[PDB]
Symmetry: C4
Subunit: 136 residues, 4 copies
């Protein structure tokens, strides 16, 4: 149970580590801009409360879906279709980003070079010495 708490503590730091990745934040910014963007629309087009809007906008981007309201106006169906698409666009972005070791490979390189350098320089001297010896 100390286990539970200690783990959760690490995980929560990992989010914050991501939450300072520029790209992740662009996505969050885009999500929110798109979120209030829809609120602006369904509010002041499809005629709906500035909270009944946010509810449809969220229920739709996340693909849950309201069991009652849908776009009435044919204009409000066009938007919803293309909106939904920005949804997918976004959820694609995250899945890509949530699926990225690059640093472990840097150390391997930092050590393999230092090694391979010495291997070379050792071999070099050996050859240079076996040369000067097998003459004089």
């Amino acid at each position: 149970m100390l286990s539970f708490i200690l783990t959760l503590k690490r995980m929560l730091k990992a989010c914050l580590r991501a939450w300072k990745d520029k790209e992740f934040q662009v996505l969050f910014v885009l999500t929110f801009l798109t979120l209030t963007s829809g609120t602006i629309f369904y509010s002041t087009v499809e005629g709906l409360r500035p909270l009944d809007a946010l509810y449809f906008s969220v229920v739709t981007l996340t693909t849950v879906g309201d069991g009652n309201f849908s776009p009435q106006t044919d204009f409000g169906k066009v938007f919803t279709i293309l909106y939904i698409f920005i949804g997918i666009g976004l959820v694609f972005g995250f899945i890509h980003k949530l699926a990225v070791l690059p640093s472990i490979l840097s150390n391997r390189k930092k050590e393999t070079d230092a090694y391979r350098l010495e291997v070379m320089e050792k071999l070099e001297a050996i050859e240079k010495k076996l040369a000067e010896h097998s003459r004089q």
Copy 2:
């Protein structure tokens, strides 16, 4: 602001590069096809206003859903059952394409480029030293 301004470019370029990927285009097409191919079926067999049939098609694929209309005809239900499977299929493929963070082919063979060099080099010196030692260990 140093970052929010710039990264966007790189970000939009990053997925712009992904359009140039062919496998993505096929998935994006099979999408557009299945989608307008659905608008055809729902505008006729289930018989809905062109634009409305598109709406239902989108919503259904993206599993968003609609709290009002559902199929009536048994052909309209069997079709839908198969139509969601296609969406499953598509998204599976999309996920596969997106979940593999493969900038690693070019790294692991760009390693091998520099590696294979070193290997012939080391081996050459190993063979030289063996040949000169051989000759001196007789004379």
Copy 3:
């Protein structure tokens, strides 16, 4: 456009390459067993046509959702809840499997060994010869 056709041809082979992975097929088998499993249930419990069943079963596992019917009986809500969970269980399985190079690393090993072996054996002879020489 020959491009289009030629690519699609490769992709479609890739599915078939997967469709002979044992694990993938277990998932498909499980999906289908679960699919008719629900059909059996909503048909002969919640009282629904043996096609109106398959439609609710599919619309629910895939998370679309019917806009009209939902489980009436409190028993049919219990199942649906836990069913939904087998859904997630499954869609987790696939995402894991759709996200797996193992063979490229085998060749690297097959070559690195043959190399490293020779490097060793070369170095070995050199030492053995420099030994017998610096005596007699």
Copy 4:
């Protein structure tokens, strides 16, 4: 049948091993919590039959949906807006955990185990040959 019989074991063991992973358990708990924590809110503030409030909670998180009931109160709507974000958050985490095919730590360091050996060996011979050559190239 050679395969269908056996693999299941390995498959069920494979995810059985994943329960033993701690990070998964937290995600699985935050799940159970958020879920029964939702049944609490919808059984009161939105006021529904215990079991029914669970149903709505599940359905909503898993974005399945329900074509009938939706929130009425503004507290019941704001809550839901935040409740789906948690689902997003959770699933994001689940995906991250599941999408990384990391049996590669144990491989890349099991390489390094055998690699580091070879490296000291080669270096030792390199140093011996350099020392014996040094002594013989004076006497």
